[PDB]
Structure formats: structure tokens, C-alpha cells
Ligand binder design. Structure first.
Ligand SMILES: Cc1cc2nc3c(=O)[nH]c(=O)nc-3n(C[C@H](O)[C@H](O)[C@H](O)COP(=O)(O)OP(=O)(O)OC[C@H]3O[C@@H](n4cnc5c(N)ncnc54)[C@H](O)[C@@H]3O)c2cc1C
Ligand SMILES: Cc1cc2nc3c(=O)[nH]c(=O)nc-3n(C[C@H](O)[C@H](O)[C@H](O)COP(=O)(O)OP(=O)(O)OC[C@H]3O[C@@H](n4cnc5c(N)ncnc54)[C@H](O)[C@@H]3O)c2cc1C
Ligand SMILES: NC(=O)c1ccc[n+]([C@@H]2O[C@H](COP(=O)([O-])OP(=O)(O)OC[C@H]3O[C@@H](n4cnc5c(N)ncnc54)[C@H](OP(=O)(O)O)[C@@H]3O)[C@@H](O)[C@H]2O)c1
Ligand SMILES: NC(=O)c1ccc[n+]([C@@H]2O[C@H](COP(=O)([O-])OP(=O)(O)OC[C@H]3O[C@@H](n4cnc5c(N)ncnc54)[C@H](OP(=O)(O)O)[C@@H]3O)[C@@H](O)[C@H]2O)c1
Lengths: 445, 445
């Protein structure tokens, strides 16, 4: 009788299916589930592809992940509370696993849940309309396996389409004339492409940090990072420097705000992403910048203009997978009727409260502690196994510290699991010398 | 009555110009809105450094690159109603670079004053036909304001082109290759491939020219590979033609003849697909690239809904003249000047054209076919007639010049079939004509 459409089979869409399956396992009647995915497989960002721009169906390439990518936070900060690393890998592993390993892990859970059967792959979501007459959603999709466009009626929609895929790509003067590659971090795939090259990186967040680190590791001659407002702050290697922003570009040269000048071979724009939902009209569409707390989302999940429509993972992330889990579990309970929603007036007030609080945050520590607090709120309302949130916050602190000490070796460190207490062993190869990013290599000796 | 024109490239311009011409001659024309997602008109001919997704996250439309020149004789694409001699005021050479032909196209439409009809930076999201109102609801995203809105229209003309959404096949090992893999659509600047071995995958105009550009601008070596037939042209010393790619490894490309070689980058010159993410199956054209797509009465009228039209969806020998021929016809049908047959009669007519299409073997037969097709469209409207049989003759001359020497075909000259003016020789052999600019082309040096 009740039908839910879940948009995307990324970590969040997986979490949503996991949430319902978990309720069903406990004897509960769950609604009919349909999950639309445009890729051929699950994993979202984590499913790797050599492709760039548009995929073989003409849909924008989703994954922004690149070769040699490893986890950027401690894995212990993203461990599933109901599916441990210990359960999955059958043994202790190091704290910063390669993409393939974390992909194997998140798949591992949904494999055990039997939820693949709900996903229509190779299917891109085209449009979502709310019908006021029947109080249902018409979800229109393109099945690229059959080359068919069809639609179905749903009672609730859960958007898990992510927000690190549609690039924010600013222009700089001279770009039409520059003789080198100008790509966005989203199209970055292989560091080897930039070996012995001089690479300009425009940005001062994780993509700048890590893509630079990848180019360094795989042998770029020189790296130049430029910042908009403030530098990354770390002590970079001898051939890597940070400067004020790019101002213009020659056929061969880049010109910066400090009056500085350099000959660059390639420009990689690590300038972030936008919240882009081409399948939604303004009545349903979330419009926001990347932040810990976007507005119009009750408990960070419920669309305030239409509370039958939900968003997962739309916040900026310190916490990732177990946030999505907490979000999806909450969305489940609302959908199912276990948690009734307040007035539209009372929802907005709760959101503004969280917003006002977000505005006071200065330090990294305050910020992921704020997110930790948000998740604590969510899990308390739910079956989801409460886990050690304060102890996670101390793991993040140790990680921040490890980065400040040496940015090129923070991945060499190890952390205690906050689910099992399993002390993660030191990896068989220091990050810098571990050229192989395969799962097989990582789990071997 | 209101008409939605989707796209402001040559076809969208031709359609606006058609409506402007009838209005100049006394007739009352319908109200007109044209939607363009780019900031300026031109379609393919509007160059951009951007690739993949534009600043709004819309897929980058233009597949055009630095140093691109008309690939056929300009005389084969002259407007019947706005000659080169009118626009330029002096005789020029036969293969103008992009900027020069982009200037020409704008010239006609600036003069017509049809810019007032176009809403730029606006992406077409959806078009639905409503039975009860017999109108079209065009949903649209206005990126200047970040607003999604919808307007009702009586007729819709689709001019979104079909050489933008790449066909991108995968080959075994692509995931491991250390060099670049891009489709022709992403190719921007040949200088990126200076001192490099580039593999061009494919057999048509893209492989020919993208290859020619890399040769011109200093690639170490070039390798073409064909799926069914070699291009059969006499290539330079450092240019290799081989049967199809089978496999790739980290550094090396492998071919069906058992030949292997180290390649630095792979350019997939494998063509394009007809993609309309903004239409449902009731209006959506599905076809491979060819002279006679089915479902289009007179190659133009959508047969299941005759209030919807497609301009320029055919494969192209003729280009701009046909878009006029098609634009005039569609205008005359909208304005009621040309009555439509019953669907059965339309589909019988379309079947005839398809039957004849399948008999075509040689290049001559094919552009002569299109020639005949354009003649049929001209005859029904007030569009100035022109010397098709002689255009076909020029196409023939162009074919010989390519066959004789594929590297020098651009240095030949042809006679205007609109004015009789013989094009002069250009001041620089193509090979040495490194400067892109309109300025450099129109001056003497
Ligand atoms: C380069 C990169 C590295 C990262 N590294 C880390 C890390 O090390 N640690 C960490 O904790 N987090 C990392 N992240 C953060 C990341 O956002 C989360 O880990 C998580 O992957 C987000 O989950 P999601 O399911 O909400 O979105 P996504 O992972 O982006 O999944 C969204 C899914 O929806 C699908 N989709 C989108 N649109 C449509 C549509 N129209 N129709 C059908 N399907 C659609 C996509 O194909 C995709 O499968 C990284 C992100 C990026 C971009
Ligand atoms: C690389 C390349 C080189 C070429 N060289 C030549 C040549 O030398 N000589 C020749 O005669 N022909 C050439 N062509 C053929 C080309 O198809 C035509 O010259 C011409 O561009 C066709 O015009 P069009 O308006 O039909 O399509 P396009 O030029 O492709 O224009 C389509 C327009 O629609 C817009 N659009 C698409 N989708 C949307 C949407 N959803 N919302 C809003 N706007 C949208 C686009 O932004 C674009 O402006 C070339 C084509 C390519 C790809
Ligand atoms: N696992 C990994 O190794 C890894 C690798 C890549 C990405 N990621 C993930 O990807 C997500 C987002 O990372 P991100 O860095 O791409 O996004 P982001 O954190 O939002 O970073 C955006 C960056 O772009 C800069 N910027 C924006 N406009 C600019 C302009 N006009 N000129 C100069 N700089 C400009 C911003 O500078 P200001 O701050 O000054 O505004 C900021 O530094 C994170 O969750 C991260 O974990 C992880
Ligand atoms: N102005 C210029 O200098 C210029 C430059 C580039 C493009 N263009 C224009 O762009 C338009 C399209 O030209 P295009 O060449 O890009 O497209 P196209 O004419 O459709 O040709 C596509 C090519 O890709 C090949 N192909 C498809 N799948 C393949 C596979 N799996 N393996 C190997 N090859 C495969 C096809 O080979 P098969 O023979 O097997 O089918 C065909 O040769 C034309 O109008 C052209 O004029 C112009």
C-alpha cells in the first residue's frame, strides 16, 4: 500500500535500504521500497570509474574519486554501528584504507541485508512532482538498459543523490588562451598524468590537500597551491608552496594576487561542488551552500515545505557513514509513523535554533563536535545502536593533530575502534611508498 | 499563440530568422521565446575552455576546439539570404577558422534583431504535452537567478543539436591506463599533446581533424584505429593506421593485428548520441546518426505529436542551408500556410524516404540524397532557392581534394553558388596557419 522511492544507491541510499531491512528483520511491516541508481553498481562516490564528464549513457559522471585515493579521516570515525570492520574483514586492518577497501566494506553490509533486489540500476532520475490531489509523488526516470522513460507513484521520496558531484568551476582571466589542461578536481583520475609536471592547484580544502599529495607522491616536478582567503596551513614538501589567489593566466604562465608569477603545465580547480538537483522544481529543491547546517531541513533531514520528502547526507561532512545511518534510521521512523512530526511552524524554529548555533563555530573541534551533537540527537530517537560519540570526537582530534605534525604521514597512524575497541595495526607500507592502491595489496603482507 | 524554441545554435537561429523574415514581409507572427543554457548564441560554434559540466553544472555543449577550421567548403554552407560577400564585404578563403564562421552566423541574426527573443543562461528541464489544454508546459531553469519556472506554449521547435552528448565505449584495461582518456567532445587544445603519442580511436571527421591538429601542433606520433574500414588517406610520416583497439594496459595499446605500442593519451573519436533528457517517450526522438531518422515528417515534424518539431537532427553534409530549409518549413506549418496530412500518410511518406536512404552506398549518393531532400523543403516555402546540383559538385571537388592530400585540402578554393564569386587563395598554407584568430585570418600576412 505504501511505496517509497529512494534516490541513489550511494552510502546514504544503502543506509536507507539498510534501515528498512533492519526494521523488517525485527518483525515490522515495512513499506514497498524502490531505489533508483544511474550507475551500474552501488557505492556512490566509492564506485570508481575511468570516465569523465558524461558516462556511457550521457548522464553526468557522478564519482569524483580518483586513483590512489585512501580514506581521509580515520576509518573508526565512519565505522557502521551495526556492521563492524571486525565482522567484515575478519581481522584488524590499518586506519586509512584505499577506496577499494572501503567500497568492499560498505557493499559488504548491504550484501548481507539482501537489499540489492530493491535497486533499479542504470536508471537516471528525471523528475519528481508532488500531486496535491492524491498527496503522492510522480517519479519519472530513464531506464538506460531498456532506453525507456517511465514514471511511478510514491508516497514518500528520499533523496540520497549526494552533493560532491556537480563541480563549482570558477573562471579566471586568460583561461581561453592557456595552453595546458584545465580540469576540475571532479575530473581528476590519475596522478601519473602529472608526473614531472608543474601543477597549479586552486583551493585550500581536502581536494587541494589530497590531490596535491597524490601528485607529489606520484612524482610531479613542482606544485603550487593558491588560496582564496586563507592557506591550508600545513608544512608542505620542498617543491610545494601556498600563495594568494590566481588573478590571471597567459598561454603558459599563471599570475597571482601577491604579484607572483609561475610557468604552469596544468591547472586543477579544487574549488568544491554545488547542490544541484535538476530533477526537482523549486517547491521541492534544496538550495544551499556547503555547510554543517543548511536550512529548511527539519532535524537535517525533513523537507520543511513538504515533510513527505526527505534528504540524506546533504550536510558538509566530518562524520560520514554513521551520520547517514542516523539520518536514514530517523527518516525510516518518520515514514513508518513511529516518530510524528511537529507543526510546520515548530519545525522551522528547531532549524533556526540549530542554525544560530552553527554560526558561533570557529575551530575544527567545535565543528565536528557540533555535528557529533546533531547525530547524538538523531540516534536517541531511534533503534540505531548508540555509539561512543564523545570518544569519536577525540579520535578526530588525534587526526587533526597528526595532520598538523606531518601532512604527508597522518595516514601512517592507527586508531582504536569505538565499536569494538579493536586497536588498528600499523600498515605494512608507509603511505608515501605504497604505490599499489588495490584491495588485494592492502590486505596482503 | 506562443512558440518555444529550444536552443540558440544555427538551427535555433535559423528558426528565429525564418519567423523574422515572414514578419518583415507583412505577416503577423506568433509570440516567440527561445531558451539557451549558454551565455551567448552560436551553439557548437561558441567556443569554451570548459569541459564536462559548465558553471551551472549543465553538461558542456560545444565539442569545438582551438585551431578548428571549417571542414567543408564555406560555399557549401552559405545562407541563401545573407551571403559572405554581404557580411564580410570582400572575398575570403574557403575554409574559415571557427571564429570567422561564428562571426558570419551572428551577423545574419544580429541584423535580423532576433536576440530580443532569447533567454540566455536558461536550461530546458522538461516539456510535457497536456491533452485537456492542447499546450506544452516547458519547465526551465534560469541560472542567472537560480529559479525554475514553467510557461505554456502552443508549438515547440527542438534545436538542441546531436553532436554534444558523447558516445564513449569502454575497452578492456581502460581502468589501469596511466595516460589521459577523453572523448573527442572534451578535446580542446592540441598543444597539450606536443611531444606525445596520441591514439585516435575512430574513423570519421573527428579522428581525421583532431589527428590533423595534433600533427600540426607537434605531436611526436599519431595512431588511428578503425572498427570496420580504414580512412584510406595518405597520412604523414609519424601517422599510423591500424585495425581496432582490443586492449590497453598501463602504458601500452594493443590492436587486433597483434600490434602493440606505447601511447601517452587516448582520444575516443567515436561519435555522439541523440539525447533529450528533457522529454518523455511521447516526444523523444530515438535514432542513430543518419540521413533519415524515422518519425520526422519531412525530416522535421514529430509524427506522434505534430505540434512538436525537430531541426537539424539528421546527419550532416549540408548544414546551415538545411537548417534554413527545415526552419522555413516548420514556420510555414506553424503559421498554417502548409496543411499536414494524416499520420498514416506522414508515416507512409517517411517510409519512402527511409527506403531510398538504405539504397545509398557512395558519398556522392548520400549528399545528393540530402541535396534532394533540401530541394523538397525549399519548394514549399518562400525561402530563396539555390544551386543544389552545383553545391553537390563542390562537395565532389572537396572529396577529391581530401583524397589527393588530406593535409592540404584546406588550401583549395571554390566558387560561391550564391554570388559566383571565386574565393581567393589564403595568405598562409593551413599547416603554417597556427594563429586561430578572425583578426589574423582577415588581415594579410
Ligand atoms: C573525492 C571524494 C573523496 C571522499 N573521501 C571520503 C573519505 O575518505 N571519507 C569519508 O568519510 N567521506 C569521503 N567523501 C565524502 C562522501 O560524500 C561520502 O563518503 C559519501 O560517499 C556520500 O554518500 P552519499 O550516498 O550521500 O552520496 P554519493 O556517494 O555521492 O552517492 C550518490 C548516489 O546517487 C546517485 N545519483 C545521483 N544522481 C542521480 C540520479 N539523477 N538518478 C539516479 N541516481 C543518481 C549517484 O550515482 C550515487 O550512486 C569523499 C567524497 C569525494 C567526492
Ligand atoms: C566539433 C564539430 C565541428 C563541426 N564543424 C562543422 C563545420 O566545419 N562545418 C559545418 O557545416 N558543420 C560543422 N559541424 C556540424 C554542426 O552540427 C553544425 O555546424 C551546427 O552547429 C548545428 O547547429 P544546431 O543548432 O542544430 O546544433 P548546435 O550547434 O549543437 O546547437 C544546439 C544549441 O542548443 C543548446 N541546448 C542544448 N540543450 C539545451 C537545453 N537543455 N536547454 C537550453 N539549451 C540547450 C546548446 O547550448 C546549443 O546552443 C561541426 C560539429 C562539431 C561537433
Ligand atoms: N578521501 C580523500 O583523499 C578526499 C579527496 C578529495 C575530496 N575529498 C572529500 O571531498 C569533500 C569536499 O572536498 P573539497 O575540498 O572538494 O570541497 P570543499 O571542502 O567545499 O572545498 C572548496 C574549496 O574551494 C575553494 N574555492 C572556492 N572558490 C574559489 C575561488 N574562486 N578561488 C580559489 N578557491 C576557491 C574554497 O576556498 P575557501 O575555503 O576560502 O572558501 C575551498 O578551499 C570533502 O568531504 C572531502 O573529504 C576527500
Ligand atoms: N570542423 C571540423 O574540423 C570537425 C572536427 C570534428 C568533428 N566535426 C563534425 O562533427 C560531426 C561528427 O563527426 P564525428 O567523426 O565526431 O562522428 P561520426 O561521424 O558519427 O563518426 C564516429 C566514428 O566513431 C567510430 N566508432 C563508433 N564506435 C566505435 C567503436 N566501438 N570502436 C572504434 N570506433 C568506433 C565510427 O566508426 P564506424 O565506421 O565503425 O561506424 C565512426 O567512424 C560531423 O558533422 C563532423 O563534420 C568537424
Amino acid at each position: 500500500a505504501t511505496r517509497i522511492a529512494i534516490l541513489g544507491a550511494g552510502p546514504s541510499g544503502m543506509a536507507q535500504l539498510r534501515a528498512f531491512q533492519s526494521a523488517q528483520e525485527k518483525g515490522a511491516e515495512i513499506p514497498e521500497l524502490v531505489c533508483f541508481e544511474k550507475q551500474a553498481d552501488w557505492g556512490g562516490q566509492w564506485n570508481y570509474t575511468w570516465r569523465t564528464g558524461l558516462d556511457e549513457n550521457g548522464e553526468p559522471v557522478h564519482s569524483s574519486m580518483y586513483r590512489y585515493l585512501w580514506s581521509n579521516g580515520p576509518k573508526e570515525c565512519l565505522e557502521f554501528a551495526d556492521y563492524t570492520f571486525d565482522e567484515h574483514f575478519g581481522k584488524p586492518i590499518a586506519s586509512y584504507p584505499p577506496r577499494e577497501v572501503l567500497w568492499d566494506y560498505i557493499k559488504g553490509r548491504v550484501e548481507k541485508a539482501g537489499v540489492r533486489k530493491y535497486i533499479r540500476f542504470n536508471t537516471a532520475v528525471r523528475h519528481v512532482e508532488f500531486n496535491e490531489d492524491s498527496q503522492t509523488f510522480t517519479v519519472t526516470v530513464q531506464d538506460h538498459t531498456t532506453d525507456t522513460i517511465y514514471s511511478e507513484e510514491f508516497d514518500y521520496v528520499v533523496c540520497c543523490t549526494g552533493h560532491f558531484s556537480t563541480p563549482y568551476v570558477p573562471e579566471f582571466e586568460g583561461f581561453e588562451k592557456f595552453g595546458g589542461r584545465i580540469l576540475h578536481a571532479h575530473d581528476f583520475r590519475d596522478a601519473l598524468e602529472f608526473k614531472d609536471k608543474t601543477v597549479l592547484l586552486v583551493g585550500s580544502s581536502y581536494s587541494a590537500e589530497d590531490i596535491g599529495s597524490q601528485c607529489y607522491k606520484y612524482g610531479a616536478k613542482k606544485l603550487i597551491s593558491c588560496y582564496r582567503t586563507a592557506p591550508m596551513g600545513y608544512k608542505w614538501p620542498e617543491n610545494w608552496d601556498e600563495r594568494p589567489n590566481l588573478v590571471r593566466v597567459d598561454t603558459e604562465n599563471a599570475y597571482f594576487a601577491d604579484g607572483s608569477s609561475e610557468k604552469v603545465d596544468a591547472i586543477i580547480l579544487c574549488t568544491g561542488y554545488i547542490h544541484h538537483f535538476p530533477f526537482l522544481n523549486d517547491d521541492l529543491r534544496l538550495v544551499t551552500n556547503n555547510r554543517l547546517w543548511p536550512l529548511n531541513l527539519y532535524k537535517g533531514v525533513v523537507w520543511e515545505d513538504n515533510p513527505k520528502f526527505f534528504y540524506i547526507g546533504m550536510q558538509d561532512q566530518w562524520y560520514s557513514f554513521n551520520m547517514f545511518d542516523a539520518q536514514a534510521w530517523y527518516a525510516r521512523d518518520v515514514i513508518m509513523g513511529r516518530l510524528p512530526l511537529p507543526s510546520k511552524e515548530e519545525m522551522k524554529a528547531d532549524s533556526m535554533a540549530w542554525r544560530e548555533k552553527e554560526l558561533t563555530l570557529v575551530t575544527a573541534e567545535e565543528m565536528y563536535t557540533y555535528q557529533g551533537d546533531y547525530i547524538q540527537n538523531l540516534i536517541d530517537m531511534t533503534d540505531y545502536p548508540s555509539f561512543d560519540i564523545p570518544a569519536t570526537n577525540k579520535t578526530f582530534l588525534e587526526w587533526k593533530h597528526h595532520k598538523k605534525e606531518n601532512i604527508m604521514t597522518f595516514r601512517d597512524h592507527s586508531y582504536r575502534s569505538l565499536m569494538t575497541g579493536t586497536m588498528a595495526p600499523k600498515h605494512h607500507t608507509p603511505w608515501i611508498d605504497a604505490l599499489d592502491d588495490s584491495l588485494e595489496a592492502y590486505l596482503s603482507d
